[PDB]
Design a protein around this nucleic acid. Structure first.
Ligand SMILES: Nc1ccn([C@H]2CC[C@@H](COP(=O)(O)OP(=O)(O)OP(=O)(O)O)O2)c(=O)n1
Ligand SMILES: [Mg+2]
Lengths: 388, 545
DNA sequence: GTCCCTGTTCGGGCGCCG
DNA sequence: GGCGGCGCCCGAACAGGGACTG
């Protein structure tokens, strides 16, 4: 076993369990009976003062449930740049392997969880892990030695395929054609039993209205957008366009664009086409991912570390649509992007009330990891500025 | 008897040590009751006589029990509790009779002197010392912060094998209170009850015969369980002449307890009666709205009410109704007029808000409460048009969502009382508004300039910049006709007004909302301040002085 | 920075249960 | 007059963001 301590002066997670539907609870009881029989978990008592919330998710078109422990708090208290540039990158679950390696005895208390019961018929049944917990940021770290040993021959015989471990799964990337790629991934699966295309990921720019008839209102809107933009591209001038509004006009009045002003607008469009200046990735600082609801199932997002130094901007596009479900699919897409690009999940600023998201998000979660999030009330100007 | 189960390993906090506190003087009654209890407990192995080698003590006392002529020995273990390790509580909540399914046979058992049958960590007993005007505990004491968790977990462990080989018998387990339900005939049921009582015995837990209920109505967890109905044990409200803060706290707590089965309970005004108070003994004169709300609650309580039991095969239906002033009542039922239970939601979130927001907040409260009691989201029946909701969902820039719901037109309805326009209105007079406020002197100006050449500036005292921007918008709304375009330089006011509020803690926002409702078309637009834009420039020059 | 406004958290009353 | 659980409600303490001074 590998001894593990916590970050200094920090104490273990004490997070209350949240309600589970009957079918999640039934799956959790089935799964935890199987896991206790095999010695992976053990019943504990209330003298362990630590706790971490547990729930379950369903497999895509399968009828097997997965137990998902939310180890965000425990993780808080405990990468190749060529991966972004490959033609096909496949995500491949390997978390199961962590159930062969034992967990440091003195640390097993910090992994405790509590299964609830409908209507509080019984007190919660507490358990702790005896093997490497999936979802913990310590399991791939410890298992790195065995994984390197497992993949030495594959990596050697396939020197162009990039394999990146992130917590519970591998990211396998190649420039191969879909058929050869599928074959090699199956080779890797058979060998290991001892999809995404990031080259096509592009930057969603900031774009301005193109039109052949401008009104006082349209130009006020344009000037506001450009004003907010100059805090990112400091070469943006508004002098001429702003001159076009001198006086006190009706919002509906048509305002012909002068030559000077039309030159200002064309040069501004060009400026917006340029890359942002002075944006460097800092791997010590945390990633922020901001999201805006643009309606019609269209969402905009920005990944940055300091205000106005956006590392990435993008969109998510998708009758009986579900806002919460579209939002969780959005954060999962953004997090998968960030794990391919920076090997690090972002801290999300969600445009939703805490209670709605907390009631419903688990119904739609599909991935083994869980990112940080805060909830925010969006100033409508920002949605206005990043829209399309 | 003492349970043979293993003891829960328990430690003090690091660097801490047992309590040394003198023994308060108790009356002759408590001393007699306490000696009569302690001689028997020491005879029984539950406490042990100790001597000068124990340098610890904690005050003891006694209180009459549930209603009986029996006594409870408590220990003021506040010190030891401040010095004892942290526990993880396993009681994740309180069971509710509405989540009970109908069973043919039902019994309720109590375990006798419960804590006193569960043993205590041998290394820890020394710290539990006490004296009577000197013993130590060998069993779980009452007043120690770790006893409830250790007992609830021990009783779970004891019941585990029985459940494992009796899946057709439901055992609802509140701390030592056992509800046992089955679809067996009375005979087979009473035999399985006997098996259970013998099992609890092998593990050291007596089920006294006096505390054994065998026939309806069962008293359980505060209620009366009948074969097809459940009711609440009678709720008696205080009828004081003069009211104190503590008295209104008792009143509102009893009304909250009633609100689970009595529909339409409201506490908003009684709750307001507690805003500024500072003492549990301060007296509060009722308002007139307080009088009316309390009278209404009383007339509700004067009516015979009952809930029913869950049927997993039928649908859960939750139906919500709007009371005045951000209050909401709901009923969860399965068959039209036979409620599983009722409830209320009146939590006032946000300075400014509309009914669609509150209705959403209520829907998610009901959803989580129902996941707890049945493990199922209900089907909602809401007083809101699918078109109202779709409109809001479209024009509201935050993620919002409601589960499967159907409309019922039992009024009052949930309406957006006005809609801001997406594009500016042709021909409508165009108002450039602004406000300014001197931070030192709290003086301010607010006003507008229009395209038809109208100007206005009002002077304001004791205001702030935000207040004065809202005053400017209000000015424009008052002096305009049914269709108006407004251009402001504040994201604050724009952001309040685009939320489409229908209530506000601010009187000014209320007046603005009334004006917005009066209008037929309004268009609100934002320009960056201090930029020399349009009429913003001239109204900005106008309200600075 | 300072001020103003808004939202969340947490603790302290009481209710109910044991 | 002790303990734990859940409920409500209110206010104090704090965080965060927009607008402002010279
Ligand atoms: N005011 C109370 C009531 C109960 N309990 C705890 C102590 C054990 C359990 C007691 O439940 P009771 O119904 O009082 O039963 P008891 O102590 O076992 O006594 P009895 O023999 O009357 O059942 O809950 C407590 O700590 N404080
Ligand atoms: Mg008892």
């Amino acid at each position: 076993t590998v001894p593990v301590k916590l970050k200094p002066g920090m104490d273990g997670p004490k997070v209350k369990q949240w309600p589970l539907t009957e079918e999640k609870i039934k799956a959790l009881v089935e799964i935890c009976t199987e896991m206790e029989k095999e010695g992976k978990i053990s019943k504990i008592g209330p003298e362990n003062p630590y706790n971490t919330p547990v729930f379950a998710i369903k497999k895509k078109d399968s009828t097997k449930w997965r137990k998902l422990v939310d180890f965000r708090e425990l993780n808080k208290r405990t990468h190749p740049a060529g991966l972004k540039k490959k033609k096909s990158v496949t995500v491949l679950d390997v978390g199961d392997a962590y159930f062969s390696v034992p967990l440091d005895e003195d640390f097993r208390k910090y992994t405790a969880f509590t299964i609830p019961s409908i209507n509080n018929e019984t007190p919660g049944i507490r358990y702790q892990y005896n093997v490497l917990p999936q979802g913990w940021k310590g399991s791939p770290a410890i298992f790195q030695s065995s994984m390197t040993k497992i993949l030495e021959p594959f990596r050697k015989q396939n020197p162009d395929i990039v394999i990146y471990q992130y917590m519970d799964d591998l990211y396998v990337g190649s420039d191969l054609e879909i058929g050869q790629h599928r074959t090699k991934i199956e080779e890797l699966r058979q060998h290991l039993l001892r999809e995404l295309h990031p080259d096509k990921w592009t930057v969603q720019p900031i774009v301005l209205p193109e039109k052949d008839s401008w009104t006082v209102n349209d130009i006020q809107k344009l000037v506001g957008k450009l004003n907010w933009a100059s805090q990112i591209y400091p070469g943006i001038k508004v002098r001429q366009l702003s001159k076009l509004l001198r006086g006190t006009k009706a919002l509906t009045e048509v305002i012909p664009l002068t030559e000077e002003a039309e030159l200002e607008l064309a040069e501004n469009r060009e400026i917006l086409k340029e890359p942002v200046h002075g944006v460097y990735y800092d791997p010590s600082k945390d990633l922020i991912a901001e999201i805006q609801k643009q309606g019609q199932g269209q969402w905009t997002y920005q990944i940055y570390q300091e205000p106005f130094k956006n590392l990435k901007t993008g969109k998510y596009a998708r009758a009986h649509t579900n806002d919460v479900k579209q939002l969780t699919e959005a954060v999962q897409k953004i997090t998968t992007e960030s794990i391919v690009i920076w090997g690090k999940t972002p801290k999300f600023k969600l445009p939703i009330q805490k209670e709605t998201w907390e009631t419903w998000w688990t119904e739609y979660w599909q991935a083994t990891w869980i990112p940080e999030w805060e909830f925010v009330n969006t100033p409508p100007l920002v949605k206005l500025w990043y829209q399309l | 008897p003492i349970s043979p189960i293993e003891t829960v390993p328990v430690k003090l906090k690091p660097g801490m040590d047992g309590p040394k506190v003198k023994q308060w003087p108790l009356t002759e009654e408590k001393i007699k009751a306490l000696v009569e209890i302690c001689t028997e407990m020491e005879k029984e192995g539950k406490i042990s006589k100790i001597g000068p080698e124990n340098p610890y003590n904690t005050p003891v006392f006694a209180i009459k029990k549930k209603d009986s002529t029996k006594w409870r020995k408590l220990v003021d273990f506040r010190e030891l509790n401040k010095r004892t390790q942290d526990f993880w509580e396993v009681q994740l909540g309180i069971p509710h009779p509405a989540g009970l399914k109908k069973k043919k046979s039902v019994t309720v058992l109590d375990v006798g002197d419960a804590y006193f049958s569960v043993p205590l960590d041998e290394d820890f007993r020394k710290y539990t010392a006490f004296t009577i005007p000197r013993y130590q505990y060998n069993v779980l004491p009452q007043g120690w912060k770790g006893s409830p968790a250790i007992f609830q977990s021990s009783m779970t462990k004891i019941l585990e094998p029985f459940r494992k080989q009796n899946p057709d018998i439901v055992i609802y387990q509140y701390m030592d209170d056992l509800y046992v339900g089955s679809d067996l005939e009375i005979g087979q049921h009473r035999t399985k009850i006997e098996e259970l009582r013998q099992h609890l015995l092998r593990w050291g837990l007596t089920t006294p015969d006096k505390k054994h209920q065998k026939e309806p109505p069962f008293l359980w967890m505060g209620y009366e369980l009948h074969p097809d109905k459940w009711t609440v044990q009678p709720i008696v409200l205080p009828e004081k002449d003069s009211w104190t803060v503590n008295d209104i706290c008792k009143l509102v707590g009893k009304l909250n307890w009633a609100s689970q089965i009595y529909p339409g309970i409201k506490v908003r005004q009684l709750s307001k009666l507690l805003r500024g108070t500072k003492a549990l003994t301060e007296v509060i004169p009722l308002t007139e709205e307080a009088e009316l709300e309390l009278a209404e609650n009383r007339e509700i309580l004067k009516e015979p009410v009952h809930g029913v039991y869950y049927d997993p095969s039928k649908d859960l239906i939750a139906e919500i109704q709007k009371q005045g002033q951000g209050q909401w009542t709901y009923q969860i039922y399965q068959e039209p007029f036979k409620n599983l239970k009722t409830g209320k939601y009146a939590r006032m979130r946000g300075a400014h808000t509309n009914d669609v927001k509150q209705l959403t907040e209520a829907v998610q409260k009901i959803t989580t409460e129902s996941i707890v009691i049945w493990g199922k989201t209900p089907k909602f029946k809401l007083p809101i048009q699918k078109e109202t909701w779709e409109t809001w969902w479209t024009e509201y820039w935050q993620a919002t969502w409601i589960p499967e719901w159907e409309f019922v037109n039992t009024p009052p309805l949930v309406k957006l009382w006005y809609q801001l326009e997406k594009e500016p209105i042709v021909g409508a007079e165009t108002f450039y508004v602004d406000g300014a406020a001197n931070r030192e002197t709290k003086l301010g100006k607010a006003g507008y300039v229009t395209n038809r050449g109208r100007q206005k500036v009002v002077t304001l005292t004791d205001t702030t910049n935000q207040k004065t921007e809202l005053q400017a918008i209000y000015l424009a709304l008052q002096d305009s006709g049914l269709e108006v375009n407004i251009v402001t330089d504040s994201q604050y006011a724009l952001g309040i007004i685009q939320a489409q509020p229908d209530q506000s803690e601010s009187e000014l926002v209320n007046q603005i909302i009334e004006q917005l409702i009066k209008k037929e078309k309004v268009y609100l637009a934002w320009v960056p301040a201090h930029k020399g834009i349009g009429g913003n420039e001239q109204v900005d020059k106008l309200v600075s002085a």
